[PDB]
Amino acid sequence: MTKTLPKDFIFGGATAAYQAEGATHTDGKGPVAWDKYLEDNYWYTAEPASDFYHKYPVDLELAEEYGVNGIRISIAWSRIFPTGYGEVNEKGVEFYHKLFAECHKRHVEPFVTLHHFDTPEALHSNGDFLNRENIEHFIDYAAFCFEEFPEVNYWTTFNEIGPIGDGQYLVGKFPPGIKYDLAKVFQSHHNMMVSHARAVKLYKDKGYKGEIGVVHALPTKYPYDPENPADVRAAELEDIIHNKFILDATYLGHYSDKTMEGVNHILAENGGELDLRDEDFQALDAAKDLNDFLGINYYMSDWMQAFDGETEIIHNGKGEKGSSKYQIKGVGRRVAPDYVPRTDWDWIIYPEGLYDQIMRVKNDYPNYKKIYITCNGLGYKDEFVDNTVYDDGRIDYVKQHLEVLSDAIADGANVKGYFIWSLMDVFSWSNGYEKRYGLFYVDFDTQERYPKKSAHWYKKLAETQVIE
Ligand SMILES: O=P(O)(O)OC[C@H]1O[C@@H](O)[C@H](O)[C@@H](O)[C@H]1O
C-alpha cells in the first residue's frame, strides 16, 4: 500500500571532483582557489579527501553492488587545462577516460558536470566569471571536453550557479570571501548563465549524440506569514535572488518584468549596477529551448519575514544549532518556523518544499522537458559503529523526499531520476569533514569504505522501486 517509482528511474549517487578526488598536486593538476583559501580560512584541506583518484574502482564496484545505476561526476577544469587555457594536461585527460570506462564497465551511467565550484585559480583570481574573458575560456574548455569524451551520453555545464554567487559574493564563505555584494551576485548569475547558453548552443550545433542540461539549486522560499503581504514580498524577492533570475534566463531567454522590478529594487537599496549586453540576450534566447533536462538540487526550504534593519549574514559551519543568521536590507530575514525539524547546521527538513518547486518550474517554465533530482541528502555526524552506521535519520530524510517525487510524478511532473548527495563520504566545502552525507562511510585515515544502513536500504529501493 506504499508508493512506487517508475521502472526506468535512475537511482544514483553524486560526487564532486575537488571534494572526492584528492591528488590536488598530482599528474599536472593546476591550483584552484580552495587551495590557499581553506588553508587560511578553515580548519581542514582537500587532502586526502576521499581519494577518488585511486579509489573509483572500489567506489564503482560497490555502487554497482548496491543497485546504483547513475553517477554525477565532474571534470576538474584545472586538471585538463592547469591554467584554464593553452596546454592540455595529458595525464588529466587519461584519468577521466579511465574513470568513464570504469563506469560503463560497472553499468553506472555518468552524468558529467564541466564546472563544480572550481575555476582554475589563475582565472578565478582574475575576476572568475565576472570577467567576460573567462566566459571564452569556458566555452573553449567545454568544446574540448565535448570532442574528447564521446563516452559520455549526459552533459551538464555548471553546478549550482545561485550557490556560487551566494557563497562567493553574498555569504563570503567561498573564495574570494566577499560579502553582501548583491551586484556581483546578480552579474555572476547573468554571466555564468550566458557561458551556459553558449556551450549548449555549441553542443547542439556540432550535433553530438547525448543530452546537455543545467543543475540548479532551488530552495523553496515561503513567506513566514502568508497573510502578511510584507512577508509575501520578502519571499518573492528572496526567491528572485536565488531562483527566478537564473531560471528565467534558462527558459525565457530574458528576465521577466517582476524579476527586473525586484532586481531594480534590491540594487537600489543596496547599491550596484549590472552590465547587460544585448548580445547576451541573443545567446540566452538561442539556448532557451535547447536544454534536454533540468537538474534540481534541493535540500531545504526558507521562510522569509520582512525586515527593516541593516544586512548581516553569519554562516554556521561548525554545527552549532542556532548560529545561522540571514538578513538583507530591502529584502528580509529568514526565520525558521517553530517546530520543523532542522539540524545542527540549521538546515530545515521540509520534503513538501520539493514538490512545490517541481510544480513551480513545471508551471512557470513548461518547456523544462525533463527533471532529474541531481542532489538531495542529509548531512550530519554519523557514528561509526559495528563497521557501519545506523543512519536511520538519513533513511528517513531520503524516504520522505522520494515519496514527494512519487507524487509530483503522479501529478504530471516529468521526473526521471534521483541522485543522492553523496555516494560516499566527502568533506564539505564550508563545513569540514564532519558533515557527512554518504551512503558509504569513508574512514579518512585509512580510506576504507563501509556500507551504511542507508546503502543497504537504497539497494532494495533500487531493485524494487517500492518506497518503504
Ligand atoms: O554545504 P554542504 O554541506 O557541502 O552541502 C552542500 C552540497 O550541495 C550541493 O548542491 C553542492 O553541489 C555540493 O558540492 C555540496 O556542497
Keyphrases for this structure?
alpha/beta, eight-stranded parallel β-barrel, five-stranded mixed β-sheet, 468 residues, hydrolase, TIM Barrel, 17 strands, 15 helices
Task: Describe the overall structure.
The protein is of the alpha/beta class and 468 residues long. Helix content is 41%, strand content 16%. The protein has a single domain, classed as Glycosidases (TIM Barrel). It has 15 helices and 17 strands. Strands 2-3-4-5-6-8-13-14 form an 8-stranded parallel beta barrel, surrounded by 7 helices. A 5-stranded mixed sheet has the order 7-9-12-11-10, with helices on one face. Strands 1-17 form a two-stranded antiparallel sheet. Helix 3 (52-65) runs parallel beside helix 5. The chain is globular, with a radius of gyration of 21 Å. It binds 6-O-phosphono-beta-D-galactopyranose. 6-O-phosphono-beta-D-galactopyranose binds next to loops.
List the helices and strands and how they pair.
Blueprint: E1 3-4, E2 10-14, H1 17-20, H2 34-41, H3 52-65, E3 70-74, H4 77-80, H5 90-105, E4 109-115, H6 121-124, H7 132-148, E5 154-159, H8 161-170, H9 182-205, E6 211-217, E7 221-223, H10 229-251, H11 257-270, H12 278-287, E8 294-297, E9 302-305, E10 312-314, E11 325-328, E12 332-334, H13 352-364, E13 371-376, H14 392-410, E14 415-421, E15 440-443, E16 448-451, H15 453-462, E17 466-467
Parallel strand pairs: 2-3, 2-14, 3-4, 4-5, 5-6, 6-8, 7-9, 8-13, 13-14
Antiparallel strand pairs: 1-17, 9-12, 10-11, 11-12, 15-16
Helix pairs in contact: 3-5, 7-9, 8-9, 8-10, 9-10, 9-12, 10-11, 13-14
The chain binds 6-O-phosphono-beta-D-galactopyranose.
6-O-phosphono-beta-D-galactopyranose (BGP) binds at residues 16, 19, 159-160, 217, 297, 375, 379, 421, 428-431, 435.
